[PDB]
């Protein structure tokens, strides 16, 4: 990958369990993969992920997950949605009531899970060869 020269590589940052990193493959969906993060039909890139467990563990919900999304997303879109799922006939206006669940739920960050889906932060890139002239190119050295 270092030898080839890419064009306009776009990086994104996602936080995930780690048990379903395998399922983020095209054509199948995992829990978080169907929840928040989606990948294209044939993405042109490599997946890189280190062990985000020891250091990222401080109960922490600042990286919570969109449990109740209204519908399956479309290719190359974000998840800016910030309201509630539609399931009944009446609007869910007025916080939690009958037949509506708020997607704000514990995604298992307690200290007792030292073996349970500890944070396994994954970074994935997407490249382009021959689509546009390259900017970041590999080294040759030797003086």
């Amino acid at each position, epitope marked *: 990958l270092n030898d080839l020269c890419f064009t306009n590589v776009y990086a994104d940052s996602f936080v995930i369990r780690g048990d379903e990193v395998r*399922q983020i493959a095209p054509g199948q*969906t*995992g*829990n978080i993969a*169907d*929840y928040n993060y989606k990948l294209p039909d044939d993405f042109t890139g490599c997946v890189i992920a280190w062990n985000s467990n020891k250091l990222d563990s401080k109960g922490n919900y600042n990286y919570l997950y969109r449990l*109740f999304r209204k*519908s*399956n997303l479309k290719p190359f879109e974000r998840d800016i949605s910030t309201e509630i799922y539609q*399931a009944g006939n009446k609007p869910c206006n007025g916080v939690a009531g009958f037949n509506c669940y708020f997607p704000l739920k514990s995604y298992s960050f307690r200290p007792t899970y030292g073996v349970g889906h500890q944070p396994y932060r994954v970074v994935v890139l997407s490249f382009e060869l021959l689509h546009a002239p390259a900017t970041v190119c590999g080294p040759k050295k030797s003086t």
Partner: nanobody, 126 residues
Framework: QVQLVESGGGLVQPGGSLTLSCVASESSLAPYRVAWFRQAPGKEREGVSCISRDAHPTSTYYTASVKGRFTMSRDNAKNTVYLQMNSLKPSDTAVYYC?????????????????WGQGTQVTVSS
């Protein structure tokens, strides 16, 4: 706009077997997830099992009380999902409903609940 018809339920002895059919009409259930629900009198509707548009066991989900005993099968040609009934117990006695939505993939906690059928009555006793 889609309506569902549950059928196949009835009186069975403990440890019996059955097969519930959720007939879908006026719409196609192939691109949409289908879930099974049961509601015996005295308790709220509870999710039984959910099958997705891809019919993949990663996307196929069963609840704890039904793991290892209940099974689905969908044939998009006839537009109906099955609910195979195995080792029926008196605790399974409930009015079994099926539900579907515009979503196509199930989860362990996300079952379609938009459109409901009339439900089928399943009783497990003598």
């Amino acid at each position: 706009q889609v309506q569902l018809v549950e059928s196949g339920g009835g009186l069975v002895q403990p440890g019996g077997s059955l097969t519930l059919s959720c007939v879908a009409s006026e719409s196609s259930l192939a691109p949409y997830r289908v879930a099974w629900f049961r509601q015996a009198p005295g308790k709220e509707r509870e999710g039984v099992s959910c099958i997705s548009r891809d019919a993949h066991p990663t996307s196929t989900y069963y609840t704890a009380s039904v793991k290892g005993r209940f099974t689905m099968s969908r044939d998009n040609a006839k537009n109906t999902v099955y609910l195979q009934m195995n080792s029926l117990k008196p605790s399974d006695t409930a009015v079994y409903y099926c539900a579907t939505d515009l979503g196509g993939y199930c989860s362990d906690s996300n079952y379609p609940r938009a459109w409901w059928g009339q439900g089928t009555q399943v009783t497990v006793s003598s």
